[PDB]
Design a protein around this motif. Structure first.
Motif: not given
Ligand SMILES: Nc1ncnc2c1ncn2[C@@H]1O[C@H](COP(=O)(O)OP(=O)(O)OP(=O)(O)O)[C@@H](O)[C@H]1O
Ligand SMILES: Nc1ncnc2c1ncn2[C@@H]1O[C@H](COP(=O)(O)OP(=O)(O)OP(=O)(O)O)[C@@H](O)[C@H]1O
Ligand SMILES: Nc1ncnc2c1ncn2[C@@H]1O[C@H](COP(=O)(O)OP(=O)(O)O)[C@@H](O)[C@H]1O
Ligand SMILES: Nc1ncnc2c1ncn2[C@@H]1O[C@H](COP(=O)(O)OP(=O)(O)O)[C@@H](O)[C@H]1O
Ligand SMILES: [Mg+2]
Ligand SMILES: [Mg+2]
Lengths: 242, 242, 242, 241
Positions: C112-129
């Protein structure tokens, strides 16, 4: 009861957060948890709400392991009421309702607001129950925001209840109507409170003193104070004054 | 005094709800606010009740703005709204005791029931003062219900009284309530009404006629009746009985 | 298919908000609602959201009236994505499920975060998800706050989509990862935007011009701009240079 | 230049995670941050990407703080790849064109795959740049997935490149073109590494040793290993991988 036998926890690898922790909290009771900052106090609630797992040692509810025995719809049994820099955005009805369990009647909400102490400030309120709050909606004095939280609680109707105090406001002796809403909310369940108000400690049916990831004390205030130098000194220095 | 010093107001950008409003209210002087539904009367009360902000201008108590007081003196002490239609049930003591801030006295309570003229139904139900009154037992009726809402008032003791009358007038006991109890309540302090009864207007010490967001009349009923064909129309058709 | 046949609406007596309104929103299509502020555009959405009932008309879906469907099921078929004031606090796992059924886990949150085009930066976040947001947690921009909302939407997976712009950062010529994440959200759904972006209209499959309560026009942009003089006014003035 | 003149940080308030940290990032090269788990390595990165705001001192760029623009910052910055599991963009274009820009070209895309040392992979993929590499078709084993990623990184040609390494899948070839590509990427930027690989620190231009939220070593490896009995301990026992 809600027992926690031999719990161990560490968020990462740096240090151990919780070390062999055992406690119990039964119906129609209140159990306070006190101690220095960084003790592990918030952490117990986190595991109790299932945000994380104990690295070792069980947490039981009525005999059955809470964990992955009661799927994560265990949250309908728990309820957590605390406050700080908050806003509730939307209609009072809307606010009192993400739970598919409560609100199906405006009258049921009224039954909740009575118990939480709000049929007085929600009647002397605009479109009454259908008012948009805050976010370029109405103005609500902090105390009211909390009573509305206690309200959702009452309707969510948890079997276990967990609290925490951050801002002074009611200093234990300051005594307010938000507190009378707490006293009503605590009545039919199993309360667990991270104590910061001195009075909150005296009335607790059982206290657990937590020093850097470990339980020092295990009983009532009265006893504990004569028995524990470090507890008593915690009560003097930080709690009341410092 | 209470001075609505020039108040322009709007929720959204399109409808500019209140234009230059400017009223002033004094002790023992009952002011009213009559007008077509849409007038913005309740909206005035919502700004008096502080739920919203004025866009231009200030509402000034004793020269010093209302916006120079806290969130909890203005609301509870000075800010009052007759409760009458609250619809309560529990115990007589508990309904009357509902969110006041202290511990009470049966002698303080009797001082207020005499003052509210409610000392009888009370003096009869024999667990008197602790009696059940509600969906449970020793039922209540519209009349009694309201006299207690008025008694609560007395306990709160407000400096500013706010009403919103009813388009529901219960026959005969309406005076024993409305015209006795309201009378003594309104008797020592600054009263502001939203009149849906003729009785009110007559006695009012000064009327403010609100038609589509503006005030069109500032005088007593007989002064306004002879001078404003729309006011006399309003009072003969929409506020009237029969 | 979402058809609103002959709708009239009023909140209060002081104005009728909508008058004899009819429209159709068909699948995989984008319908826009333009017109000055006050026409009743937010109100129609509110009516579709079922916050209110049509005082006269009839909103229907696939032939079945929406008043039938029952409050819960309706709110689950619909989804509404808007812009800022809307700060989120908690986790990226919590801000994406709350008020949903169980399972499909962080893996389902990735897609879903991929569909929203978030994923990249979400992975790049500390404890991601398992990252905390808001005051308690981390920093997030306006552009990222909403992408998470588009994400939550993808996940809630509505049949009917609603939205609008109440701020200038996406002018209509100003295109980004957000407006493009929205374009993917609009995909397999019956979309309806309260247009404010100059481009949105030029693309919209059918437009509905609303003036003070009524639908003056209904068709594609080009068509309405030649045929309707008053539409041109909205298009060159209020829209282009205000 | 990126300088962290005296940084103190604490997420909670009872544990001062970082106490006086100071580093200076420099042109066209690498800088490492080796040290034990509770050190604060990730936490420095979490501050370099402004996720959290410090307690004492500012992080300087070419002299100025970072109060510029969340946008300019996020741009100049870089997230790396492998942590990017498998992305089903089901199209080479789409995978390298995740949240990127205005538009991109074919001629451009390949210019990059030639820079990422990844041109040929693609030639054997039906409907070249339009090819699926997901659960549904043309499954890549992993070495190529992570390089297609350095390629994305190659798109916005950032000033600052941030990394984080681990699990050395010794298909040494993977590290061969992975190193070659990573080299082509690092070579000409201000690089910052949290090395979990020896290869990296050996030729880093200056390393920092972070033990329990503080710097304890500040120089090229050749010097540290001889001057710090705890650095060499870390490097031979826990960093060998
Ligand atoms: N997300 C985290 N990651 C790693 N360690 C953490 C994290 N959150 C808290 N800690 C550690 O756990 C200890 C803290 O918290 P806890 O929240 O258990 O404290 P308390 O003693 O419960 O205090 P309070 O209720 O006021 O937060 C801290 O001192 C910190 O070292
Ligand atoms: N809760 C309400 N009570 C009474 N009238 C309302 C209410 N909400 C909106 N209105 C009225 O409906 C009209 C407004 O809103 P709508 O929200 O329908 O506007 P739009 O046409 O969507 O404009 P905008 O979104 O820019 O405010 C206004 O003129 C306002 O007076
Ligand atoms: N929640 C609201 N949002 C926007 N406008 C409202 C709202 N509530 C009332 N109004 C507007 O306020 C005016 C009515 O004021 P109100 O105080 O309710 O009137 P009155 O009490 O005199 O009947 C109307 O123009 C109405 O549309
Ligand atoms: N979210 C958090 N809240 C509180 N403390 C944290 C948090 N995350 C990490 N820490 C603390 O930061 C320190 C580790 O920093 P971190 O950057 O994770 O280390 P490293 O990168 O070297 O593994 C530990 O003492 C840990 O308890
Ligand atoms: Mg209204
Ligand atoms: Mg970390």
């Amino acid at each position: 009861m809600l027992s926690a036998r031999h719990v161990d926890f560490a968020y990462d690898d740096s240090e151990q957060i919780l070390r062999d922790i055992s406690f119990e909290a039964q119906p129609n009771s209140i159990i306070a948890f006190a101690g220095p900052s960084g003790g592990g106090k918030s952490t117990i609630f986190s595991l109790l709400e299932r945000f994380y797992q104990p690295t070792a040692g069980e947490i039981t509810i009525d005999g059955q392991p809470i964990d992955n025995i009661s799927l994560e719809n265990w949250r309908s049994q728990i309820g957590f009421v605390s406050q700080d820099s908050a806003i509730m955005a939307g209609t009072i009805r809307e606010n009192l309702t993400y739970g598919l369990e409560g609100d199906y009647t405006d009258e049921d909400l009224w039954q909740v607001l009575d118990l939480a102490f709000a049929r007085s400030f929600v009647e002397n309120m605009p479109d009454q129950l259908n008012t948009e709050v805050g976010e370029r909606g109405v103005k609500i004095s902090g105390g009211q925001r909390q009573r509305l939280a206690i309200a959702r609680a009452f309707l969510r109707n948890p079997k276990i209840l967990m609290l925490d105090e951050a801002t002074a406001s009611l200093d234990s002796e300051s005594e307010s109507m938000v507190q009378k809403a707490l006293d009503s909310l605590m009545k039919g369940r199993t309360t667990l409170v991270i104590a910061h108000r001195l009075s909150t400690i005296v009335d607790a049916d059982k206290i657990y003193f937590i020093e850097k990831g470990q339980i020092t004390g295990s009983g009532k205030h009265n006893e504990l104070v004569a028995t524990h130098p470090l507890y008593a000194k915690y009560v003097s220095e930080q709690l009341t004054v410092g």
